[PDB]
Design a protein around this ligand. Structure first.
Ligand code: GDP
Ligand code: MG
Length: 158
């Protein structure tokens, strides 16, 4: 079966572990050790296709050169994580030695009212990279499937 290796990157505390657990395990984690950096697998039906998703959930503390898709995650109530989005894009290009990496920018925690990063603000950065932008909430599952599935399709075009 078609297997897709996805990599979740972004500053700590933006919800990288919660988005994977919501997608894979279908529930919301209130806490997840920031130093756990593991793979997580689940067979899914994307637009109606049996794909095997191998997701690597990264941490500050498991190969990324082999990842074919990267979700770049910040939180809408964390400017600092939005400002660091550029560092991870440069690390993706470095580790893949190409400026043509299938990639999706994700604004997590959009269930929170104390928002700082604006939508057009994130959309402008997305058009800067030529990549889609999807607002997600690991707590409500909002856009969670759309974030990951868009990446596979971005892989499917590449
Ligand atoms: N309200 C809300 N909280 C979230 C969301 N996603 C993650 N969190 C919380 O943010 C905290 C850090 O998330 P975590 O997945 O461990 O961060 P990371 O793995 O370092 O990126 C956790 O306590 C989550 O409960 C979300 O969509 N909405
Ligand atoms: Mg974590």
């Amino acid at each position: 079966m078609t297997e897709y290796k996805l990599v979740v990157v972004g500053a700590d505390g933006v919800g990288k572990s919660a988005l994977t657990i919501q997608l894979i395990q279908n529930h919301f984690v209130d806490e997840y050790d920031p130093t756990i950096e593991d793979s997580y697998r689940k067979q899914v039906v994307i637009d109606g296709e049996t794909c095997l998703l191998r997701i690597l959930d990264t941490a500050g503390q498991q190969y990324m050169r082999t990842g074919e898709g990267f979700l770049c995650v910040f939180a809408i109530n964390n400017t600092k994580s939005f400002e660091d989005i550029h560092h991870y894009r440069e690390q993706i290009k470095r580790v893949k030695d190409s400026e043509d990496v299938p990639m999706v920018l994700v604004g997590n925690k959009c269930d929170l009212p104390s928002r700082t990063v604006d939508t057009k603000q994130a959309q402008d950065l997305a058009r800067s990279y030529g990549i889609p932008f999807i607002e997600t909430s690991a707590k409500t599952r909002q856009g969670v499937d759309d974030a990951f599935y868009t990446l596979v399709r971005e892989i499917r075009k590449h």
